[PDB]
Design a binder for this molecule. Structure first.
Ligand SMILES: O=c1ccn([C@@H]2O[C@H](CO)[C@@H](OP(=O)(O)O)[C@H]2O)c(=O)[nH]1
Length: 124
């Protein structure tokens, strides 16, 4: 009984740490958040800002989604994030990732009532 909003929080939110993600961060996080249960999710981004700040993006800059849909929004301010990218030698179930911190604008898709983030589209 996990909503799309809850799923977005599980896959993309990590407010706790003021971003100091070690080189082990993604290996631990991708596993702890169950993103390597059925397969090694190739790419996944974690946002370190507050839930309120990320939810607020749904009222910010409306931009086209990569899939052509029109319900994506870009944050006006840059946000602290951590990108997780599966390594080349990574082999399920032992999913391995490269951890890379960044400060960029995020683009999320929003749906529902309340209108909240349900998909992370990209960082720019
Ligand atoms: O910078 C990026 C690009 C893509 N993705 C994620 O990679 C998947 C394929 O695009 C998407 O996950 P989903 O299918 O569960 O919504 C998207 O959120 C990220 O996390 N960060």
């Amino acid at each position: 009984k996990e909503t799309a909003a809850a799923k977005f929080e599980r896959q993309h939110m990590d407010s706790s740490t003021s971003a100091a993600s070690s080189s082990n961060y993604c290996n631990q996080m991708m596993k702890s958040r169950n993103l390597t249960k059925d397969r090694c999710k190739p790419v996944n981004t974690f946002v370190h800002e507050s839930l309120a700040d990320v939810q607020a993006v749904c009222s910010q800059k409306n931009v086209a989604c990569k899939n052509g849909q029109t319900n994506c929004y870009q944050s006006y301010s840059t946000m602290s994030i951590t990108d997780c990218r599966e390594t080349g030698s990574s082999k399920y179930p032992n999913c391995a990732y490269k951890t890379t911190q960044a400060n960029k604008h995020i683009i999320v898709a929003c749906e529902g009532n309340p209108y909240v983030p349900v998909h992370f589209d990209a960082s720019v």
